[PDB]
A paper describes a structure:
Here, we investigate the molecular origins of the nearly billionfold rate enhancement achieved by directed evolution of the computationally designed Kemp eliminase [name] (7). The Kemp elimination is a well-studied model for proton transfer from carbon that has served as a benchmark for de novo design. All [name] variants have an inactive conformational sub-state, rooted in the original protein scaffold, which was gradually supplanted with a catalytically competent sub-state as evolution progressed.
Estimating the respective populations from the volumes of duplicated cross peaks shows that the inactive species comprises ~25% of the [name] and [name].7 samples at 25 °C, but only 5% of [name].17. Taken together, these data show that: (i) the [name] variants all exhibit a slow, pre-existing equilibrium between active and inactive conformational sub-states; (ii) the last 10 rounds of directed evolution ([name].7→G3.17) substantially reduced the population of inactive species present under ambient conditions; and (iii) moving away from the conditions employed for selection (i.e., higher temperatures or pH) increases the fraction of enzyme in the inactive state.
Numbering used by the authors: 4 to 302
The structure:
Amino acid sequence: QSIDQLIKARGKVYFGVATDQNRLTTGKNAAIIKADFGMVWPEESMQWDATEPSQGNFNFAGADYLVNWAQQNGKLIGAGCLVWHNFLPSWVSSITDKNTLINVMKNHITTLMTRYKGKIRTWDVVGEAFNEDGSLRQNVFLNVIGEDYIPIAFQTARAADPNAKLYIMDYNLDSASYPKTQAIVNRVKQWRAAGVPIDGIGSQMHLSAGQGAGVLQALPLLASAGTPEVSILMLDVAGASPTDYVNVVNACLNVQSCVGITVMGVADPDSAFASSTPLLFDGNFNPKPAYNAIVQNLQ
């Protein structure tokens, strides 16, 4: 049974998965995504190095493949990350001055979002903006633009595609008692009061065994920032315990504003963390106990 169909039958928007052209042309990925998932996200093909390897020179080969595949196959699309330190070319982090970096950042946001305007559900506009203590991460954007980079990024994104949900995302937001979780909430509330159009907080849930339980209170904390939505993305769990995965699903179900859950991949051997068998399908692309437990929890 399809966990996407089942979660939609509980009133959520999707059960999604990260993928890309390289996965869709091989193995059983495409067949499983077609059958069991309702939203796809590009793992890497929309990241900065892939789409803008030098200033103003864009390419969309991978991104177009994924967006077109989704459309061809009736799947929702989320995309990102527009502004974060990962996949960031040195040409960008070598920028030393505020206005240059603002204009580079705006042009990157605008170009990517405009290309797919109206067809993308969610854009991860800003990612991994926080340190573990809740201060803002000293990536090149914070270092050079200052804290206004987050307001600017979101306002630019809203202009580029007003139909898209605009998210901030971070990891280690998995306990309500962790300073990072508290800080993103406080800062998002503030930013929204300042008119920054942050529609969602996305919790990048790369979890170790036993961490699912903490999400039951972390997720409503994230939802208390007042964004219209929250979501779970990049979900995987070391060991793929049914208990961890069911806890995450229940947190989603318990949080009105939580629209859905995206897993970081389909089958364990293709995970960057393959040896931790942290996904819902095994190396033979068969559903794992955790997949069945999610089915049972959503029936």
